[PDB]
């Protein structure tokens, strides 16, 4: 029934603004308050404000009142939020949530339905496309006949990149690692998949890396 679909991930320079959106489906959009929240990395959730979609009236947190604006577009059932004056503190995953008790007989604020989250990265680094390098298999056989091969996605900005193996026809035994921010300001991750060593050379393995902010999609085959 009810699902809240948010905007895709964005990356802004320090000092600029970001407009994160959140689209409601499955219920009358007017008559339920839309709260906006955020989660700093490894810090838990912060509440920012709520918006009445019937009136457009808002109440922001006192920390955010000069900087944030929550607006509605009632006919497409989309809630917007515009946070200005972005600092490196403002790098967070941003969530919209429905207050159920502004449409029922309770007095709390219960977030029964949330959005999927929007990663907003605030950094001074410009957008740079990834370089993809193979992690070739060798005499690497633990567990008997069990080889490991991989793909290194190094020096890209911003997050995310999506990696898949053989157009998504290899999901078993694959570990895609979280990206690590470097001293250069650029992200790097690695994606590995374990396969039997008997299948080395009989089966060809290609990792499909796609970086949507830079419009980069490269397919490279990893060979021993």
């Amino acid at each position: 029934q009810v699902q809240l679909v948010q905007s895709g991930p964005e990356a802004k320079k320090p000092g600029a603004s970001v407009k994160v959106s959140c689209q409601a489906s499955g219920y009358p959009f007017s008559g339920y308050y839309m709260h906006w929240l955020r989660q700093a990395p490894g810090q838990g959730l912060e509440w920012m404000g709520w918006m009445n979609p019937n009136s457009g009236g808002t109440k922001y947190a006192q920390r955010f009142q000069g900087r944030v604006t929550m607006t509605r577009d009632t006919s497409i059932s989309t809630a917007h939020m515009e946070l200005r004056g972005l600092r490196s503190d403002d790098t967070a995953v941003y969530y919209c949530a429905r207050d159920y008790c502004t449409g029922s007989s309770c007095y709390r604020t219960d977030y029964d339905y949330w959005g999927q989250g929007t990663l907003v990265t605030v950094s001074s680094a410009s957008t740079k496309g990834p370089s993809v390098f193979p992690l070739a298999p060798s005499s690497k056989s633990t567990s008997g006949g069990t080889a490991a091969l991989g793909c290194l996605v190094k020096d890209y900005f911003p997050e995310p990149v999506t990696v898949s193996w053989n157009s998504g026809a290899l999901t078993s035994g694959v570990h895609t690692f979280p990206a690590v921010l470097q001293s250069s300001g650029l992200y790097s991750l690695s994606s590995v998949v374990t396969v039997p060593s008997s299948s080395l050379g009989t089966q060809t393995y290609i990792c499909n890396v796609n970086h949507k902010p830079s419009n980069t999609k490269v397919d490279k085959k990893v060979e021993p």
Partner: protein
């Protein structure tokens, strides 16, 4: 102004075990507290409203109690689809505040890491950089220490490591530590070794190559 403190910071438990986590409010909030389940990458799910009432669709193993300042959330017969980071949230007075979180981990039999090491690609060496990659595969628990040594001289301040989320099938972890050098630094040495210290590992395993 209502600080919310949860205890403990992180805990590990097995499937079927009963565990309780506490949530403390800085001031009086009577029953205006909600419990949320939060798996990484996905949306939070409301579990307990009004500090004791179960949300629709939430299974019967979840239970909550408490009023005033001290609140508890109890899961009785733990299931692999319940392991997440849990938050408590006050709704009495604005601003709305949350707890810091409580990571819930799956206890399992202790598993040794499969150690793989990766020389830098020739395509990267023509670009003038070199990244040597060590892979630790399918281990428990999460704590494992990786040390790079080249020609029995251990490195420091030039290696970055990342660990995966806990797997959903075997409840294991995977770690990748990446040592980064220049091309002139890479072609200057012979032995490139990766030492692993893990709890399910008797002697520290050293995996190496000579290119």
């Amino acid at each position: 102004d209502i600080q919310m403190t949860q205890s403990p910071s992180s805990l590990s438990a097995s499937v079927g075990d009963r565990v309780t986590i506490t949530c403390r409010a800085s001031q009086i909030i009577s029953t205006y507290l909600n419990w949320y389940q939060h798996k990484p990458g996905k949306a939070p799910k409301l579990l307990i409203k009004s500090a004791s009432t179960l949300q629709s669709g939430v299974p019967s193993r979840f239970s909550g109690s408490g009023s005033g300042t001290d609140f508890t959330l109890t899961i009785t017969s733990l299931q692999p689809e319940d392991f997440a980071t849990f938050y408590c949230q006050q709704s009495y007075r604005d601003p709305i505040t949350f707890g810091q979180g409580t990571r819930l981990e799956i206890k399992r039999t202790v598993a040794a890491p499969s150690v793989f090491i990766f020389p830098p690609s020739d395509e990267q060496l023509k670009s003038g950089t070199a990244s040597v990659v060590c892979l630790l595969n399918n281990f428990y628990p999460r704590e494992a220490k990786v040390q790079w040594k080249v020609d029995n001289a251990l490195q420091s301040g030039n290696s970055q490591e990342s660990v995966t989320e806990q797997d959903s099938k075997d409840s294991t972890y995977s770690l990748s530590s990446t040592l980064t050098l220049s091309k002139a630094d890479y072609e200057k040495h012979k032995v490139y070794a990766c030492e692993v210290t893990h709890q399910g590992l008797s002697s520290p395993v050293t995996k190496s190559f000579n290119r």
